[model samples]
Target: ASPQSVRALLERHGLFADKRFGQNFLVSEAHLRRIVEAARPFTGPVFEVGPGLGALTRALLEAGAEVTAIEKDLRLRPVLEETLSGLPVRLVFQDALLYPWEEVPQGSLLVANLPYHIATPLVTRLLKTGRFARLVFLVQKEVAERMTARPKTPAYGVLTLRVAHHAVAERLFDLPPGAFFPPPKVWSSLVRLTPTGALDDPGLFRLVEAAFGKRRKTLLNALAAAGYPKARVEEALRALGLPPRVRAEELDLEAFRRLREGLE
Candidate 1:
């Protein structure tokens, strides 16, 4: 849809793009096709977070996938109803975060051009669920780097570690700021996450969070300051062939897992 088309559609609904919602509708048909092409492989149900103007939602539906969209803004309900009328889309009027996970069928694929406001927390929650067979998102470029970042890199931190435990995070492609209607200040990237079937452990996650809490501190000191026994932490470090003063960023997921086990 062109900028004028987007505006006209909203005008028809007696609405305007709400800036508070980080509303940026994709107006490029080429980009829309690229996004749909990526979703073509997933034949299962797709749980979409923000159906904004229903552009991507329309493409996913055209690709022969069952789509269930959780749209927070009721204003877009009419817009989606008109655009996707006569189509079978299960529209749930609620915040994606508050949507009961039990209602989502197991092994479903998730796709979204996520809103900036809820990106981090929402991605963290979904990754932890481990219910998605394949997860794809259009997120801020920096956020995508953080997800696929390697240990010791500037982008590596809690998100990388947490997602690494459950999936293989990959950056599929990048989208310029001009791609959206109200072009955002920052560029965006497409990220795809394949489930690794790893089990989520609260204990291990707590340990990982603490380890990166103070990135400047040594691994021993960081864990020690977080209430782990200094002796045990040092022992785990030595057992794993790591230096006594190594920082949390230097350790990979396996190392963190071993440390968590040794500490227990």
Candidate 2:
């Protein structure tokens, strides 16, 4: 369906996406087609977060993947119930931010037009779980850039390295604010993340948190405050060939990886 056609379908039912939940339905079938195209190669259970009105849910169903959707708004249950019922989709009524991963079976593929407020945290949690085989999300364009944002770039942050710790993230494409209902103030983008092999050390994440927790401090000082001894922190920086005075965002993922090992 084209954007107008998709809007027409929802309007025919006297429905509009709830702005309170950051519900921005992907009105373009062509855009949705791109996502399904990229995700269809993988074989496994599929999960959709914030499946408002089941627009993407319908797409996932048609893609021939077993679909499970997590939606926070119980108010939208009837909408999803009507749209997704009798289809190859399961609708779970729960806030995606607080939804228990244990309740979801291990190793599923996650697809979503994510809630903006929770996107970073949700992605962080999902990456930590290392459960989803792959995840493709419609997220804020700036946030998407930051995820794939390189070190030393303005878009980069602790979120960047934290995500890089577990999976490789690639931005698929961009979606204009107009593509959504009531158009968001900012633009949006589609991002793909693959949860591949095991990480060398989970402790790397803690080290990253500490580094950013004290972003103003130098790496040597931050690591020490985060519990690495001064001598060990200095040695770690030397081993990684990094400047002891470097800020968290100044180092790329590879340097951070080595820094983590050095701290240990």
Candidate 3:
């Protein structure tokens, strides 16, 4: 929908964009086409989040993929019903975070213009589920960087490590603020995450939390705060040939894994 049409449609329904929900409708057809093209090779069930006004949803349907869309706001349900009427899209009205894990099709592909408010935890939840074959999300540009960031970069941290442990994240493209109806204050970027089939390791995540808990601290000090013995941590670092003062951000996933094993 054009900006005028989006405004008109909302006004007709006495609905305005709710800031509490971080509502920003994608109005750029060119960008929408790019998003759809990213999913062209995936013929599996396409699960979409926050299908506001059905812009990208329309394209996914056109691409001949079965779609199950989760929309949190009931107010937009009427609009989505009208926008996606006569299509085979399954519209589930509930918080995407609370979506039933059992219902997600095996080896599905996820596509969504995620809301800024729920993007972080929602992406974390989905990646942890280990169900989707691939995920394409339009998220904050900064977040895109963090998702695909490497060790020692300013953007690298627990999020980067955790996401990298589960999938190979890539920054596909950028979407400027002006591309949306109620343009966001910050620019957004498209990120794709391909699952690595690695099993979830809560211990590794807990270890990571400790390492980055105090970014400025050495790994020994950081792990100390998480109840890991300082002597053992230092010993592990020594065994791994890492410096005693090395920071968490200075180590890669394999390094952390080795540290965890050595600490054991």
Candidate 4:
């Protein structure tokens, strides 16, 4: 449906966007197609979050996929009912954060235009569940950068390492502010996360908390959070043939892997 049609639907239903709900209906057809395209090989059932007015849901269903969309605020029920009626979708009325995600089948595809506020927290939670094979979602461009951020870059931090701990995230593309109704002031990006690696290990993450705990502190001092002595940290760094003065941001995943051996 065209943006005008979506606007007409909202007016007819006496509905309006609620900033509290982060309800900005995606109105761009090109962006819709792009999202669906990135979700190719979409054989499994899709678990979508915030399926506002069923815009992306419609596209997913048209491509022969079944969806279970979780929408908390049922104020838009009438609009969703009209748009997604009789489609291969099961509308679940529950808060995504509060919902028991274990109920969803394993290997399901996680899809959504995630609510902006809870995006990062929810992503960390979902990836931990290990329920989905892959996740494709539209999130704040800022978060997308942090999720896919690499070592030695300004964008890198705990979120980057934590996300990398569970999945390989890729920033696919960005959508302009004009792409949605009541256009968002900031840009949005689509990200694809594929859970690769027999390396679902979390030991590195414990080190991560220590490393990123005090960003201004050097790695030697930051490990103090883990109660490691500076002399021992120095010995560990030299033991691994790495710089004893290395800062937290200076080490990548593998670099941390080597450090884990020294301290542990």
| Per-prediction TM-score | 0.95, 0.89, 0.96, 0.94
Q: Candidate 4 on 88-148: residue-level lDDT in tens?
A: 7889988899877756677778888999987888878778777778899999888899999
Colliding residue pairs in candidate 1: none
Q: Pick the candidate with the highest lDDT.
A: 3
Q: What lDDT tens digits, residue by residue, belong to model 1 across residues 206-226? A: 999999887779989988999
lDDT of 2 by residue, 1-264 (tens): 556865776777677777788877777777878888878765878888888878788888887889879888887777677777688777888888777864566678888889998998888888878777888998898999989998878898877876677788999888898777757899998899987745435577778778777767887787789787889878888877777687778888888778767666
lDDT of 3 by residue, 1-264 (tens): 677888888888788889887899998888999998887677578999999889899988988879999888899988898888889988998888898754677698999999998888888888888888899999999999899998889999988988999999889999988889899999999999998877579999889899999877888998998899989898899999998799999999999999989978
Q: Which 10 consecutive positions of candidate 3 have the poorest summed lDDT?
A: 97-106
Minimum summed lDDT over a 10-residue window in model 2 is located at 196-205
lDDT of 3 at 230: 89
lDDT score at residue 187, model 3, on the 0-100 scale = 95
C-alpha lDDT values of all predictions = 0.86, 0.80, 0.88, 0.84
Best by TM-score: 3
Native-to-model Cα distance after best TM-score fit, residue 74 in candidate 2, in Å = 2.1
Order of candidate numbers by lDDT, starting with the best: 3, 1, 4, 2
- Greater lDDT among 2 and 3 belongs to 3
